[PDB]
Design a protein around this ligand. Structure first.
Ligand SMILES: CC(C)(COP(=O)(O)O)[C@@H](O)C(=O)NCCC(=O)NCCc1ccc2c(c1)OCO2
Ligand SMILES: CC(C)(COP(=O)(O)O)[C@@H](O)C(=O)NCCC(=O)NCCc1ccc2c(c1)OCO2
Ligand SMILES: Nc1ncnc2c1ncn2[C@@H]1O[C@H](COP(=O)(O)OP(=O)(O)O)[C@@H](O)[C@H]1O
Ligand SMILES: Nc1ncnc2c1ncn2[C@@H]1O[C@H](COP(=O)(O)OP(=O)(O)O)[C@@H](O)[C@H]1O
Ligand SMILES: [Mg+2]
Ligand SMILES: [Mg+2]
Lengths: 265, 265
């Protein structure tokens, strides 16, 4: 029984490894006390930790464990998942959309963090609550899927009216830029708008560093995508529209947890 | 007299050259017909137009107008103002924070658009409205200046008693602290500071990124989004300096396109 844990800002991602068969488990970071409780009802050969709240588990537990830096673990665990699912990428950008967003360039050998931005799942939840007073994640994201962004977001065509614009008319020109023109807004529409801006910024920054480091492959991981097809859709379609190849990975959110186990030896 | 006009998504910038004197004027883009009726009264030697709404002006007036693309006009005006204000820059990014944001790299001889994002002035107004119900720009910005982002934004140190792999004071996630502070009723000022906060962080991030890519330490910020918004300017200025780049703000920078259309011929 080997256990990899990525204790991040919002979710604790738990990977158990036993007989080459891995099981996946997730807890809220708010419930970190229940993860410690659970760990001590377990027999564990090796415990491998990563992410911001790894210290909290490390100090509150009796058994020995080892801490690894999340950027390396994510990069190592991601690489493992990609290969198992049939993707042979000599290089790629990967964007880790957790509570916040961290961007890395994997050159084929190692990773380097090339950027980051505070627009992630934290903002989806945070700004989502402020606009809808919903706290429940499933409730929030499900509702957002029905949303229409037309009355909230402003497109290039809306600025350029009938004159042909210098860049595609369909692009978002300003997020939340149509609001002051439609003053006569449902939580669906508002929540979809929040997810939309988060998506478009992440994709923008991803595509920019992808171009900077001369690769067309962009991989998107993080729990921010779970139960949120709209976010996934917003990211993939713009990646494609800029001539890059988006990649999604099953259990991609557990890259840090798996990478920790791999970094351990 | 001579008249240059940048008719944008939110503001119409008007530069009047008469008797060796410049007059800088702003009218709301909702009042475009009003601007049109003013142009028809006037004695004008040369009318030069740019921006998305330039076409609405041209088809409604009774004199000829020369139309140019706002990217080329913005660049020409900015290079004029820069040289006039003592600046001798070999190369730079210029970040145009208008209704939306457009990023450009000036190599010495010409500009090329290197990216954009819909986080800008129009987001500040629309999103600000949803969180406060304030539709008056001046009320919106004034209110936001005394805002405190502490209880709303999530920093890197808050995710990590551990030493983080990147500086702890940085924003990890905008609005990422909201779920932790549910009990607090969030003041309009504090919410609006965080709106301005995320807009400033995204644009500055992208401008720093493209600056690194095109190998320039100079980033010139323009656009009327900075008008009456010390917070935005500060957010953008401090983080540009934070990342080892030189930020430049230009007197009449928001009128770059209006000036530049008069000198693009
Ligand atoms: C911190 C962390 C690695 C933690 O991983 P996780 O818990 O999985 O989200 C991840 O959230 C992250 O990379 N967040 C974004 C950190 C970042 O690169 N911020 C730059 C955006 C920014 C731009 C301007 C800023 C600023 C911050 O602080 C003040 O001025
Ligand atoms: C269009 C315009 C030049 C108009 O000038 P102005 O009125 O001076 O702000 C300016 O607002 C601008 O550059 N806006 C941003 C356009 C852009 O580069 N968008 C990319 C961000 C984006 C990312 C993903 C998207 C998307 C848009 O559309 C849906 O999918
Ligand atoms: N069951 C859930 N509870 C809360 N947030 C969730 C859940 N499922 C997905 N999320 C989303 O995932 C985000 C966290 O993503 P993750 O990659 O786990 O980041 P971290 O490593 O910071 O925990 C949340 O902010 C939210 O947008
Ligand atoms: N008088 C004003 N009324 C409304 N918004 C203003 C005003 N002055 C400055 N702004 C801000 O500047 C933005 C417009 O910037 P600008 O560069 O003029 O954009 P555009 O070229 O699209 O008109 C607005 O979205 C708003 O945030
Ligand atoms: Mg994480
Ligand atoms: Mg403009």
């Amino acid at each position: 029984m080997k256990v990899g844990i990525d204790a991040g800002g919002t979710l604790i991602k738990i990977v158990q490894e036993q007989d080459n068969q891995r099981t996946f488990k997730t807890e809220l970071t708010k419930n970190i006390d229940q993860v410690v409780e659970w760990l001590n009802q377990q027999q564990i050969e090796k415990l491998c930790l990563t992410g911001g709240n790894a210290g909290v588990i490390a100090e509150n537990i009796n058994i020995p464990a080892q801490i690894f830096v999340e950027f390396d673990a994510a990069s190592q665990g991601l690489g493992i998942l990609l290969k198992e699912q049939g993707h042979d990428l000599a290089d790629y950008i990967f964007a880790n959309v957790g509570t916040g967003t961290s961007l890395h360039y994997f050159d084929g050998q190692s990773q380097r963090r090339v950027g980051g931005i505070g627009t992630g799942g934290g903002m989806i939840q945070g700004l989502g609550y402020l606009l809808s007073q919903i706290t429940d994640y499933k409730q929030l994201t499900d509702m957002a899927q029905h949303g229409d962004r037309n009355t909230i977001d402003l497109k290039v065509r809306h600025i350029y009216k009938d004159t042909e614009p210098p860049i595609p008319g369909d692009l978002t020109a300003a997020n939340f830029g149509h609001v002051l023109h439609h003053l006569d807004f449902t939580p669906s529409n508002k929540l979809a708008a929040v997810i939309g801006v988060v998506g478009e910024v992440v994709t923008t920054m991803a595509i920019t560093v992808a171009r900077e480091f001369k690769t067309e492959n962009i991989v998107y991981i993080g729990s921010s995508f779970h139960n949120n097809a709209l976010l996934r859709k917003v990211v993939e379609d713009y990646t494609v529209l800029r001539g890059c190849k988006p990649y999604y990975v099953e259990n991609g959110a557990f890259s840090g947890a798996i990478g920790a186990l791999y970094l351990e030896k």
